[PDB]
Design a protein around this ligand. Structure first.
Ligand SMILES: C[C@H]1O[C@H](O)[C@H](O)[C@@H](O)[C@H]1N[C@H]1C=C(CO)[C@@H](O)[C@H](O)[C@H]1O
Ligand SMILES: C[C@H]1O[C@H](O)[C@H](O)[C@@H](O)[C@H]1N[C@H]1C=C(CO)[C@@H](O)[C@H](O)[C@H]1O
Lengths: 586, 586
């Protein structure tokens, strides 16, 4: 028995306030009935399906049903209940299930989609401003080695006009969207110890440099996302003012105008971020704090989204811990509130959250558009390709396990959510992925191909594309090497080619995703959008041949190889050692 | 490799604001390190564990760690990360996992537990008031057969003083808590078409009869839960007033004081419950509607919870669809609001929701205490024992699948949530389970044993205990046969004995639950609380012998058989055909 379905054309078609749903089946004991299990306002529905007279592909029987769209919430969840005389079987994002799937692990399509539809067309690039580029006309020097000493106090001098001036490089790289680390007034170099949410830190060029950057990116058609740090302030902020270098500080004034914006124990110690005293945690019980951060018309969240700043959204730092009373009490309401405020100021605003852990409860409640997809994308690859994980603990997973992991996670997400998940191989909070591969550094191009072809929006971490390496923070924030002698020019070109493949093909931006093969060293999946197919074959080990069973998903006119040295012929994949290949259908 | 852990003593112990956590391991290639993956305010933690010098059982190595309780939210989620030099493996509620478990499918213990701790000590009994008992001093006659005609208009005359008068029968049955179907003024016999939330329907004896019932149950130490129907009103309610048999109705007055409490289309048709025009749906966008239902001090939810009514809580009818704008928009906020209001009036109030489907998103967000556990308890048994399901579609699942199903569902719930899940074999909205067994009716006692020994609180559906049967509503609401000639007296006695076993043994009220064996016809599980063990063996088919491997969970002084004709000796279970046995440890 075989089944196929993806939450996208050719399997679904919207027509006259109905969502038509098509299931493919093949095999020797097909169910004489199939029920479309759908859902309206959380009520499970049993919708009849009927066989189509015409086979869509050789040996395949298509069943078709219909979801009425006029009622019910935008997110439409569904699965397939195959019925024989004596038994039943479910078809799900995670293949066949002998007992019913979880409601939150069904196929899901958001209709209407009120999310930021532009995100799926982007290539993102994350910039740690101090370490990217100095402007022409502007404390360590650029070539001085990064050391473990005083990580938070060492400034190399990168600034925002440096980014503006490097926009032609980013354009040629294929970048269409920037995510900046914090830029607001803060004493440190990473600047997550915020001192003024209302001003750009002059060390990066002040408010004028960020306005120029906003103008310049608009001119080039590039989106711009700011780092929003709202779980905690810095202890130098006027609200907290630990060093009494001002008046009215919550820290040393029981009568401060912001005494209730922080939580102090019966010992006097304020609650902070994971025991970092420089980062006192904000108490979202306070109705005045809520108004200042997101509630009011000129709250911090909306401020940088309205003119003149007109930012395209917010990365939410430590989104999972924000809440009341010193911890994450009422976390989901407040993150929903932040997102709601942002979409009020800008309906197409992108709001994604930093989630090192499992983001599904946040995303399944729709309190944010997306997450930094560490759990669903990054760590599976650290495991499969680099033998490591979030804690740098040894990891030994084969392709079966890696794809069970990746597919299980996204089964909790609608198609539209999957398409805008924020995927990267590393960040300012992890060791460089190049370094993590260790002796297996020749696998790095596999990961770059995978980054641009797995569902979600890819984000290059500045410098990855030219081969910078280093261990975890502090050593992952090296100055970007602008000397081509210090650049991996071959790696740069692969990044260029992948972003070109992405712009070129709708399936890599909008397409469903079906894992076709996943055994030991080899992963094969296909992206699927209308008649278009994109086949990707990853081999982390030595040369091998793999038979691909006839799949109606792969029944095309022909395949044109676009990247890598793999060869597909008569259902046999010839894959060189440590390779990734991408075929486009003809 | 083997592992054991349950979210209860002997595996966990709270001491000096720390939660101590113990893992059992056995096998030939044990991990030299184990990390306790815990969570504080949603931040994943890596806590070290250390081997205990003393083996807790032969061949078992114990690791122990510690969760700091002074910070973080009440619900403490955790799992075990076994680490070797080259690889890792997770231990979870669902056995070993090669990739990390979902955050919401870990072990979880609620500390402090702010839920209704009395629920786990209860035996519930659900009464459909018209069909239970007529009072001594009071339209069909009691012995007239139930027909398909005019189901909603046929009254047999049961009333609340009938229940009061039958309290000695319920006491002897072992019942400690009642759940009543709706009793408020409504035209129908089931009375889910509410006309007045503020008055008891005189057909059941009016307000005086319910006060007597509240007094009488208090006198007998019995709890009392009312059916709260807040997703929709009846169309005869004054607010809606479809038949203009009053003034000010939302239905026929664009200026009604409650026009905004209902949602009308640009056609004039109000939104209702699943196309039943007699049940117009309430619009929880309205700030005045929110205040009347749960927001205000004398709102409907709090009204029946304060004196003189002093009810113990609310069953929430159609809890999953309640929301704004004609559908389930903002459903979770409003159900949280209802529960919050109830616990404000009565801190130990029990609020559970009607969930035919998958309740996990509601329970994982803690918007309610519990659910009618159709998905986690009822339908697995309909499948395993009666070959059917929610849609009365054929079902063929063996013990492996049934227990994978039951254990997967509860893995999404903390220990405390599992203990108060509202388990029943049938209800006023399903065919009688006795009828569903069809030719396999001899399996009915297996299900009764299972109802009283699976985690959760059992609820007898009135008449089940004496063998009434019938198909789905209308035929599942027969008049209760008070003639002992029409009663299955042997079935009645099993119910009595099971509720006695439950009162007698802490493990059946508080205990963890570990499935030990689940192959084909046979299910074996053990409830576990401190040194106490309760072993349950269910065999749905012919006589068989089953070997039980040595389990440290089963290493006790001895076993005393308490119910059924099974025999345990030297790791061999001798199980008669179609049997259920319960052993208590010695
Ligand atoms: C605020 C934190 O969470 C956010 O979400 C950022 O993503 C992180 O970078 C993170 N750390 C910042 C703060 C500290 C702590 O002292 C430093 O250790 C880091 O270098 C620095 O970046
Ligand atoms: C309101 C509904 O949901 C609640 O939650 C109850 O649990 C159900 O019983 C259910 N049905 C009631 C209403 C109708 C519909 O016309 C009748 O069909 C039923 O007989 C009657 O009981």
């Amino acid at each position: 028995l075989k089944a196929w379905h993806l939450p996208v054309a050719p399997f679904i078609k919207e027509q006259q306030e109905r969502l038509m749903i098509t299931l493919w089946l093949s095999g020797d004991d097909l169910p004489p009935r199939v029920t479309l299990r759908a859902e309206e306002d959380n009520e499970e529905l049993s919708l009849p399906m009927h066989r189509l007279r015409q086979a869509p592909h050789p040996g395949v029987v298509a069943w078709r049903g219909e979801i009425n769209l006029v009622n019910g919430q935008p997110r439409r969840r569904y699965s397939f209940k195959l019925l024989w005389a004596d038994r039943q079987l479910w078809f799900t994002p995670q293949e066949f299930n002998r007992f019913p799937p979880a409601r939150l692990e069904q196929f899901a399509v958001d209709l209407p989609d009120s999310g930021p539809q532009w995100v799926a067309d982007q290539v993102f690039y994350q910039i740690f401003p101090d370490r990217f580029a100095r402007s022409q006309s502007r404390r360590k020097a650029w070539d001085e080695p990064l050391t473990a000493e005083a990580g938070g106090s060492t400034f190399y001098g990168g600034d925002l006009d440096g980014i503006s001036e490097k926009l032609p490089y980013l354009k040629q790289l294929g970048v269409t969207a920037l995510y900046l680390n914090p830029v607001f007034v803060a004493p440190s170099v990473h600047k997550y110890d915020t001192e003024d949410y209302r001003r750009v830190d002059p060390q990066f060029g002040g408010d004028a440099a960020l306005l120029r950057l906003r103008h310049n990116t608009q001119k080039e058609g590039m989106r711009l996302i700011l780092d929003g740090v709202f779980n905690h302030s810095g202890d130098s902020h006027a609200w907290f003012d630990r060093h009494q270098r001002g008046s009215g500080g919550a820290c040393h004034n029981a009568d401060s105008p912001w005494r209730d914006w922080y939580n102090f124990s019966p010992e006097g110690v304020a609650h902070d971020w994971l025991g970092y005293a420089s980062l006192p945690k904000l108490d979202y019980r306070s109705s005045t704090l809520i108004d200042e951060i997101y509630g009011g018309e000129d709250s911090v969240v909306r401020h940088w989204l309205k003119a003149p700043w007109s930012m395209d959204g917010w990365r939410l730092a430590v989104v999972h811990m924000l809440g009341e009373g010193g911890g994450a009490r009422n976390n989901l309401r407040h993150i929903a509130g932040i997102t709601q405020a942002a979409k009020l100021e800008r309906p197409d605003a992108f709001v994604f959250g930093e989630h090192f852990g499992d983001a599904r409860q946040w995303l399944q409640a729709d309190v944010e558009d997306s997450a930094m997809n560490y759990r669903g994308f990054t760590f599976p690859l650290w495991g499969f390709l680099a033998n490591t994980d979030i804690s740098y603990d040894p990891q030994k997973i084969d392709a079966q396990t890696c794809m069970a992991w990746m597919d299980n996670y996204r089964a909790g997400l609608s198609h539209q959510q999957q398409l805008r998940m924020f995927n990267q191989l590393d960040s300012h909070d992890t060791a460089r992925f190049k370094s993590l591969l260790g002796k297996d550094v020749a696998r790095l191009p596999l990961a770059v191909v995978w980054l641009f072809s797995w569902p979600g929006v890819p984000c290059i971490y500045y410098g990855d594309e030219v081969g910078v390496d280093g261990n975890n923070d502090p050593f992952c924030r090296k100055p970007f090497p602008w000397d081509p002698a210090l650049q991996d020019g071959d790696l740069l070109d692969l990044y260029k080619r992948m972003s070109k493949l992405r712009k070129a093909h709708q399936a890599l931006r909008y397409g469903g995703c079906q894992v076709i093969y996943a055994e030991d060293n080899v992963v094969v999946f296909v992206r699927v959008y209308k008649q278009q197919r994109v086949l990707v074959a990853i081999n982390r080990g030595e040369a091998c041949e793999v038979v691909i069973e006839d799949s109606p998903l792969l029944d095309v006119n022909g395949w044109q190889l676009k990247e890598g040295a793999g060869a597909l012929h008569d259902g046999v994949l010839t894959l060189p050692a440590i390779s990734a290949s991408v075929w486009f259908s003809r």
